[PDB]
Amino acid sequence: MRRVVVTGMGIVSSIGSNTEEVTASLREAKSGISRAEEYAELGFRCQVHGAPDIDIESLVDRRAMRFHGRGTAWNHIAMDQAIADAGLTEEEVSNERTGIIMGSGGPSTRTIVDSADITREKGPKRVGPFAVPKAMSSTASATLATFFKIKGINYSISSACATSNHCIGNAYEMIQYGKQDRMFAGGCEDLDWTLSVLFDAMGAMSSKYNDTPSTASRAYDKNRDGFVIAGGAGVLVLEDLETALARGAKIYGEIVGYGATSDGYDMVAPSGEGAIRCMKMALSTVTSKIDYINPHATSTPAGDAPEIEAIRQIFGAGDVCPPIAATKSLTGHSLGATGVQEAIYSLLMMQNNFICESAHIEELDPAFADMPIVRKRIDNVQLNTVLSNSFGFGGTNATLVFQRYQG
Amino acid sequence: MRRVVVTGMGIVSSIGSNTEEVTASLREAKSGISRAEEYAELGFRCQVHGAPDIDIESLVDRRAMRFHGRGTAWNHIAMDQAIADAGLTEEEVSNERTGIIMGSGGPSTRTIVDSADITREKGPKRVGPFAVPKAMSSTASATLATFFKIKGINYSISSACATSNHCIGNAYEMIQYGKQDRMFAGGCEDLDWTLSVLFDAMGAMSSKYNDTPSTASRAYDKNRDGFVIAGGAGVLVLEDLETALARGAKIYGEIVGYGATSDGYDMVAPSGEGAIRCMKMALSTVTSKIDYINPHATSTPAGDAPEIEAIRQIFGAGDVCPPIAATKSLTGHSLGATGVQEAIYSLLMMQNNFICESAHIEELDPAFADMPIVRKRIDNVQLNTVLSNSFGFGGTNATLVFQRYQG
Numbered sequence: 001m002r003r004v005v006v007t008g009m010g011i012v013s014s015i016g017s018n019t020e021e022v023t024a025s026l027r028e029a030k031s032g033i034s035r036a037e038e039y040a041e042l043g044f045r046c047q048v049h050g051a052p053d054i055d056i057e058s059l060v061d062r063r064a065m066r067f068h069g070r071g072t073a074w075n076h077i078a079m080d081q082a083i084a085d086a087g088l089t090e091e092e093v094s095n096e097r098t099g100i101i102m103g104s105g106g107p108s109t110r111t112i113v114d115s116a117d118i119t120r121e122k123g124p125k126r127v128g129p130f131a132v133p134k135a136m137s138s139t140a141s142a143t144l145a146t147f148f149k150i151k152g153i154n155y156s157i158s159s160a161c162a163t164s165n166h167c168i169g170n171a172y173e174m175i176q177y178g179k180q181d182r183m184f185a186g187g188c189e190d191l192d193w194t195l196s197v198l199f200d201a202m203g204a205m206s207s208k209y210n211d212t213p214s215t216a217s218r219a220y221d222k223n224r225d226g227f228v229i230a231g232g233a234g235v236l237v238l239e240d241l242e243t244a245l246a247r248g249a250k251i252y253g254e255i256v257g258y259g260a261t262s263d264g265y266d267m268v269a270p271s272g273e274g275a276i277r278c279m280k281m282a283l284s285t286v287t288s289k290i291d292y293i294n295p296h297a298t299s300t301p302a303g304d305a306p307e308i309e310a311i312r313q314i315f316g317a318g319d320v321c322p323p324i325a326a327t328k329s330l331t332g333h334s335l336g337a338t339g340v341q342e343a344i345y346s347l348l349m350m351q352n353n354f355i356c357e358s359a360h361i362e363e364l365d366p367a368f369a370d371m372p373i374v375r376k377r378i379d380n381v382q383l384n385t386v387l388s389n390s391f392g393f394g395g396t397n398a399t400l401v402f403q404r405y406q407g
Numbered sequence: 408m409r410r411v412v413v414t415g416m417g418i419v420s421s422i423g424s425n426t427e428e429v430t431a432s433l434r435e436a437k438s439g440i441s442r443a444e445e446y447a448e449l450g451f452r453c454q455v456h457g458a459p460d461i462d463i464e465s466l467v468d469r470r471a472m473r474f475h476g477r478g479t480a481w482n483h484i485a486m487d488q489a490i491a492d493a494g495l496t497e498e499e500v501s502n503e504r505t506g507i508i509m510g511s512g513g514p515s516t517r518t519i520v521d522s523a524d525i526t527r528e529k530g531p532k533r534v535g536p537f538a539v540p541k542a543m544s545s546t547a548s549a550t551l552a553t554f555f556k557i558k559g560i561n562y563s564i565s566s567a568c569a570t571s572n573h574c575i576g577n578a579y580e581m582i583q584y585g586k587q588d589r590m591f592a593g594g595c596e597d598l599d600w601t602l603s604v605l606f607d608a609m610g611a612m613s614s615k616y617n618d619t620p621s622t623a624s625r626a627y628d629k630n631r632d633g634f635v636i637a638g639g640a641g642v643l644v645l646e647d648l649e650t651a652l653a654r655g656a657k658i659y660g661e662i663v664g665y666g667a668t669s670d671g672y673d674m675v676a677p678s679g680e681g682a683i684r685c686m687k688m689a690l691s692t693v694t695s696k697i698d699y700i701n702p703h704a705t706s707t708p709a710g711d712a713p714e715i716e717a718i719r720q721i722f723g724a725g726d727v728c729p730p731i732a733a734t735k736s737l738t739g740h741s742l743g744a745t746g747v748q749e750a751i752y753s754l755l756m757m758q759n760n761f762i763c764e765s766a767h768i769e770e771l772d773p774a775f776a777d778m779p780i781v782r783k784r785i786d787n788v789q790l791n792t793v794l795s796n797s798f799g800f801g802g803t804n805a806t807l808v809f810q811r812y813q814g
């Protein structure tokens with residue numbers, strides 16, 4: 001099997017519109033969570049969200065927007081960023097050896113609802129002719145593959161919270177096995193009431209911190225009360241090592257492990273043992289210690305704990321366990337975008353020699369008192385190997401491990 | 408690489424609720440297309456559809472239905488059928504070596520619209536707590552993985568019309584490379600006005616045959632005027648050859664080729680050259696002649712023709728080209744379900760030694776007069792190798808090749 005490296009990154013996040021803004025937010029523990037006035041107007045319990053702040057029309061031209069919902073428009077921006085970061089020529093983007101696996105947890109729910117509404121109000125013709133590519137589950141891959149003239153692999157993986165972790169892992173496999181030499185991998189999610197309401201109705205999102213929105217997402221806090229939803233996108237450029245070296249690529253890291261398993265247990269709560277198997281699978285090909293864990297931890301009573309127990313089973317407790325810092329306390333949970341964004345946060349922390357605070361822990365849950373959850377930013381630390389989990393509804397698990405390239 | 412065989416099949420289709428009914432429909436060219444009265448009531452141009460006729464409540468119990476939209480309920484039925492056909496024990500279904508890649512072109516658009524409607528009419532709580540797994544793009548994998556206690560791989564691929572072809576191809580790869588020994592692969596789609604209207608608004612569906620619905624889908628006919636939408640599901644059980652042989656499995660066929668490419672051209676029309684590359688990739692690992700082609704051909708002016716030219720480029724014209732019969736003329740286009748259903752139709756034709764008529768060709772398009780499009784059922788033919796294309800919006804291409812197992 002060939003070695004696979006990350007040569008470019010792009011991101012649209014609740015904590016920044018590019019990698020520089022994201023890095024500053026991570027370093028300063030600047031929350032991306034704000035009040036969602038619209039959710040209050042609609043009668044939601046949860047009235048907080050993690051909204052990107054970015055001017056799409058200034059970055060994606062009108063004709064290029066024809067088939068984009070707002071999630072895939074963010075993904076287009078992230079792809080432009082990743083291409084620029086990697087320094088790719090047009091020929092390097094568009095060729096038979098270069099593919100795309102780009103996913104979202106759902107499609108444009110807003111397009112679907114707006115279309116149903118206008119059908120009933122003004123008639124089917126008034127849906128317009130461009131709604132299908134926005135409404136389909138493959139929207140993120142179809143729109144970008146077409147626009148960027150991708151000629152190799154083209155499809156989406158979805159797996160709820162795990163979506164863009166599996167997209168990256170499958171793209172990794174394609175390159176390892178020699179089927180493609182370069183891949184664009186990642187994902188996105190729109191942020192829209194038509195999606196958020198589904199989670200509010202199940203009671204899954206935070207509602208006890210509506211008056212202090214910035215601190216509503218608080219993984220590992222004793223009084224965590226649900227996740228905070230977000231939208232955004234991320235893209236990695238992946239290349240086989242020889243391809244990267246030969247063109248003088250930047251190497252942000254090497255992908256050195258990938259795990260994917262299934263709980264076969266509960267639709268909306270994890271079993272724990274599935275996560276253990278997933279992390280073990282990712283670690284089976286890794287020969288250095290793990291220096292940092294970017295957990296799944298979404299700030300839920302039932303979710304944060306089983307993952308911690310899984311981590312304890314593999315790594316032990318206390319100082320011998322890698323430092324753990326939940327970036328979702330700053331960013332919220334961007335569903336399809338989460339895996340790739342967390343890969344990017346982890347790679348940026350590696351680049352900049354720090355581990356962010358696990359934010360908004362006002363009172364640590366005593367169940368986790370034995371674990372090295374980061375309470376204050378750790379500076380001047382050399383990270384060489386980082387692990388990131390994403391564990392999604394339907395018992396779907398994905399873990400990725402990235403390593404500093406040193407030959 | 409390991410060899411991979413199909414050991415069980417399940418299907419819910421517009422042309423039958425199991426493989427026996429489907430076989431009878433193929434043999435007798437019995438159309439599955441009917442009038443869609445609801446589409447007329449809503450003001451659609453197209454007023455035809457391919458609707459399954461199956462009693463879900465009699466086949467999936469109430470608690471098992473909690474997280475199913477109607478597409479994934481059909482997929483559950485197809486999975487039960489495939490498990491029974493393969494003769495699998497509970498331990499063979501649920502183990503770390505057995506996974507699922509099961510997709511849909513979209514999620515339950517009906518769940519999304521109903522939820523938005525009830526939010527506005529009665530409040531967010533009245534969405535209920537079970538809508539998320541129905542509305543997410545991974546619905547088909549999440550629901551079945553959880554219910555059937557799947558422990559290995561668990562995710563969905565989506566790629567519009569190509570969805571379940573890529574699901575099968577990626578599952579094939581997993582087994583080839585030794586990561587899993589058994590996979591459930593396939594997909595589904597609900598049939599609902601909230602999805603169909605998106606296609607009617609783009610003018611993509613047939614509307615000149617509303618008064619003769621049964622003949623509205625007519626691939627290769629001079630007067631074809633758009634596809635006919637359908638819903639349903641299909642599942643294949645895939646196993647590495649040694650696993651299959653050792654347990655006395657039925658072998659419906661061996662997967663011997665898989666192609667996946669990208670046009671990088673137009674969102675809603677094919678380039679043709681992408682399809683050539685896709686078929687060539689699938690054929691690169693095949694060492695016998697092709698005895699039958701199950702085309703993408705959806706009964707559209709702009710779609711049927713470029714595929715025929717691609718076929719002509721690879722295979723030539725006339726008698727030296729494999730017989731071509733478009734099953735969508737009987738079945739309509741079931742989007743996420745199409746690839747796996749067409750695999751099943753092709754394997755059933757192989758099993759039963761016939762090639763179905765390419766139905767509803769009242770006047771052949773003169774552009775295709777040189778091609779061996781099947782005008783009347785061909786009997787007493789031994790099929791050993793069959794090829795099936797699916798080419799989806801966003802320029803996404805997938806081809807599979809199956810072969811009669813003879814050692």
Ligand SMILES: O=c1ccc2ccc(O)cc2o1
Pocket residue numbers: 104105106107109159160161162195198335336393539540542543544
């Ligand atoms: O990651 C997810 C999980 C559920 C889900 C449900 C609906 C949707 O539109 C997107 C979603 O993304």
Ligand SMILES: O=c1ccc2ccc(O)cc2o1
Pocket residue numbers: 132133135136137511512513514516566567568569602605742743800
């Ligand atoms: O195969 C498809 C293509 C487009 C599409 C669009 C919306 C949807 O809900 C399902 C779909 O399936």
Ligand SMILES: [Cl-]
Pocket residue numbers: 068069070071072073107108139189190
């Ligand atoms: Cl979107």
Ligand SMILES: [Cl-]
Pocket residue numbers: 265266267268553
């Ligand atoms: Cl459940």
Ligand SMILES: [Cl-]
Pocket residue numbers: 475476477478479480514515546596597
């Ligand atoms: Cl469904």
Ligand SMILES: [Cl-]
Pocket residue numbers: 146672673674675
């Ligand atoms: Cl286009």
Ligand code: NA
Pocket residue numbers: 294295296342388389390
């Ligand atoms: Na993570």
Ligand code: NA
Pocket residue numbers: 701702703749795796797
């Ligand atoms: Na086909």
